[PDB]
Design a protein around this nucleic acid. Structure first.
Ligand SMILES: Nc1ncnc2c1ncn2[C@@H]1O[C@H](COP(=O)(O)O)[C@@H](O)[C@H]1O
Length: 637
DNA sequence: GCTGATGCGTA
DNA sequence: GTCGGAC
DNA sequence: GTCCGACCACGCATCAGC
């Protein structure tokens, strides 16, 4: 019963006979590290989910109290999202911790990190007393995380490091690697919230919980054919997934799960205001072409695409209001002005609601929307409604809860109707999305032109009646986003490659990204405008490594200016011209491209740049000019 | 008390 | 946001 | 088509080091 050889990958896995801790005992972390180890070793999701489910099966069998930590460890989360825990541990610290844990120089082990592309294997390969401290447990290592996440104030980083040295010198075998990876936030397991859910639902279904030990019922799949066992699990699979969608808070599910069992969960775990839900999202479309096929025979509506923050507004019985972002973080304290205007936006009939809206930066003096970059300069922290400098206008466009009742399983027509009926527009505080419902291949295209005129990113397009319900389990991108840059219309740039960046794991070794530049005629310089790491195939990314290998330089050219950009690992004789696409342009505090052209102190950078195509026809001389770029940014009114 | 390095969470 | 890998 | 882990600018909050 040694865990150094534990194996949930095994075949005909017996939850008890194959475990590596006697029952009731605390689950070793090495089990987890092993599980993780056997997961990282295949690449097929369907294997990975069973191998996790094996660990879970045992955990449910022997040590039920450790189920929650084990799941949180596998998610690399610290707890429910709306509590806002955060490690506050970076690569910088994590390293200091490793260096102190082993001996070497900070820049020594730092070097080992940036050319292995992963701290986890810097951690463990490095050689911690004559005594091995007693071995790490999953409950403990979880609770050492939260301990790191609670420390704050002066000299908090010291204490943070100090716990990490502990964990490390107590690590055996591969633990020091997955511990290092979790704390760096890049667990990069291969399975996420979805698969962990798949594995958990397989595990309680295979090895049902609450059994008096030893459990009579170990594999509850035995009496079934393959076809039977498979669509059985998928069924239970969808029980857990959907229920979690409505209530995505493990600390409340896992108890209930354990007591009344999986199939009865959806009657104790009701969608309720006060718990942040993951919002519904969409999918791009090439144009009003791809529209009429995905939607086919179903009336749709058309809504403005708003360049703001999605905010999801919860209203309990008894007046407590809380406001949540799309990541389920609590944003209430961030928005006191909206907590105050609540009574002015509901009919006093309304006792409880959940609203799907989009907070946009709004100018009062001129009655017009300001772009997202302005909005981002709100204070996050505990505000006082007095000192708001950047007003915000809410754009409500759906309804999930109304007076005790969940509207999830009901069509958008209905959902919009009740929203139109119980809530009240007040211009530049709270309105409905500017809309149209219509099907004409032309008047739609006229409405987009008018939206993008209004300082909006494009058009949302939502089915009114067919499939137009909200349930984000069976799908979670079920409307369509008609942009302008998804279209031949989208305005690209041709920019110059002036350096390269070494990659991180899954791209460590090869070039991970590039720093690009625009040509400034007046000073004759190349000014770095942004970095680029998105959207070349692995093969194209070596086409580049082989066509830039000749051009590596030890020093920048003198006519290249990057200001406070990240220094490339490999500077590059300036030769390669790529076609780059971006959503919008922005006023950069660190990029010199076109500085002074549009603002006394800030050049311009690209939000969300992706690489499209190389341009062999263009020399660095014919790329986009900083003059042209300044003109581009202005064209965003 | 301030500043630079950076973690985190908006896009 | 949108990407490619690998199923 | 789905899931996963990447990539990016930017600004507020936080803390070590001065
Ligand atoms: N009218 C709307 N309805 C729903 N979501 C919206 C709306 N306007 C903006 N959004 C959000 O903004 C995003 C727009 O994406 P684009 O590619 O900029 C969407 O994914 C939503 O999260």
């Amino acid at each position: 019963l040694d865990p150094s050889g534990y194996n949930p990958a095994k075949n005909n896995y017996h939850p008890v006979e194959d475990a590596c801790w006697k029952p009731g005992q605390k689950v070793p972390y090495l089990a987890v590290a092993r599980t993780f180890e056997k997961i990282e070793e295949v690449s097929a999701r369907l294997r990975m989910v069973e191998t996790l489910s094996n660990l879970l099966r045992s955990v449910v069998a022997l040590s039920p109290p450790d189920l929650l930590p084990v799941l949180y460890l596998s998610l690399n989360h610290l707890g429910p999202p709306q509590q806002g825990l955060a490690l506050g541990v970076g690569d910088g610290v994590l390293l200091k911790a490793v260096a102190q844990a082993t001996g070497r120089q900070l820049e020594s082990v730092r070097a080992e990190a940036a050319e292995k592309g992963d701290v986890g294997l810097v951690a463990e390969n490095s050689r911690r007393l004559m005594l091995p401290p007693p071995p790490l447990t999953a409950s403990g290592v979880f609770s050492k995380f939260r301990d790191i996440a609670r420390l704050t104030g002066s000299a908090s980083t010291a204490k943070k490091i100090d716990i990490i040295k502990g964990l490390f010198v107590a690590c055996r075998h591969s633990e020091a690697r997955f511990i290092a990876r979790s704390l760096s936030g890049r667990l990069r397991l291969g399975l996420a919230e979805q698969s962990v859910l798949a594995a958990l639902s397989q595990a309680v279904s295979l090895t049902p919980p609450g059994q008096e030990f030893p459990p009579a019922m170990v594999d509850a799949g035995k009496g079934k054919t393959a076809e039977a066992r498979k669509t059985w699990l998928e069924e239970q699979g969808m029980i857990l997934k959907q229920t979690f969608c409505e209530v995505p808070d493990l600390d409340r599910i896992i108890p209930v799960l354990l007591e009344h069992g999986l199939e009865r969960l959806p009657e104790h775990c009701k969608l309720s205001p006060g718990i942040p839900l993951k919002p519904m999202l969409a999918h791009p479309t090439r144009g009003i072409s791809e529209v009429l096929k995905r939607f086919e025979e179903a009336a749709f509506t058309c809504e403005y695409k708003y360049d703001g923050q999605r905010a999801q507004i919860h209203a309990l019985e008894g007046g407590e209001v809380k406001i949540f972002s799309r990541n389920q973080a609590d944003n209430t304290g961030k928005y006191p002005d909206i907590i105050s205007r609540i009574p002015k936006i509901k009919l006093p009939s309304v006792t409880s609601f959940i609203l799907d809206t989009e907070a946009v930066a709004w100018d009062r003096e001129k009655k017009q929307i300001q772009p997202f970059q302005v909005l981002t300069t709100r204070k996050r922290k505990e505000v006082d409604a007095s000192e708001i400098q950047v007003q915000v206008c809410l754009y409500a466009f759906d309804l999930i809860y109304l007076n005790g009742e969940s509207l999830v399983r009901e069509p958008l027509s209905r959902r919009r109707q009740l929203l139109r009926e119980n809530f009240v527009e007040t211009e530049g505080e709270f309105v409905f999305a500017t809309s149209l419902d219509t099907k004409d291949i032309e008047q739609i295209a006229e409405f987009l032109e008018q939206s993008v005129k209004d300082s909006c990113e494009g058009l949302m397009v939502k089915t009114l009646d067919v499939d137009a319900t909200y349930e984000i389990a069976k799908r979670s991108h079920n409307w369509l986003k008609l942009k302008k840059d998804y279209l031949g219309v989208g305005d690209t740039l041709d920019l110059v490659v002036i350096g390269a960046y070494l990659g991180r794991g899954k791209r460590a070794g090869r070039y991970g990204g590039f720093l690009l530049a625009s040509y400034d005629e007046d000073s004759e310089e190349l000014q770095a405008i942004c970095k680029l790491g998105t959207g070349f195939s692995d093969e194209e990314l070596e086409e580049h490594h082989q066509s830039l290998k000749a051009l590596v330089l030890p020093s920048p050219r003198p006519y290249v200016r990057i200001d406070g950009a990240v220094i490339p690992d490999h500077w590059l004789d300036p030769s390669a011209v790529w076609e780059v696409k971006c959503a919008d342009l922005s006023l950069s505090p660190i990029y010199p491209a076109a500085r002074g052209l549009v603002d006394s102190d800030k050049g311009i950078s690209l939000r969300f740049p992706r690489f499209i195509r190389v341009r062999e026809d263009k020399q660095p001389e014919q790329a986009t000019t900083s003059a042209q770029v300044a003109c581009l940014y202005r064209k965003q009114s």
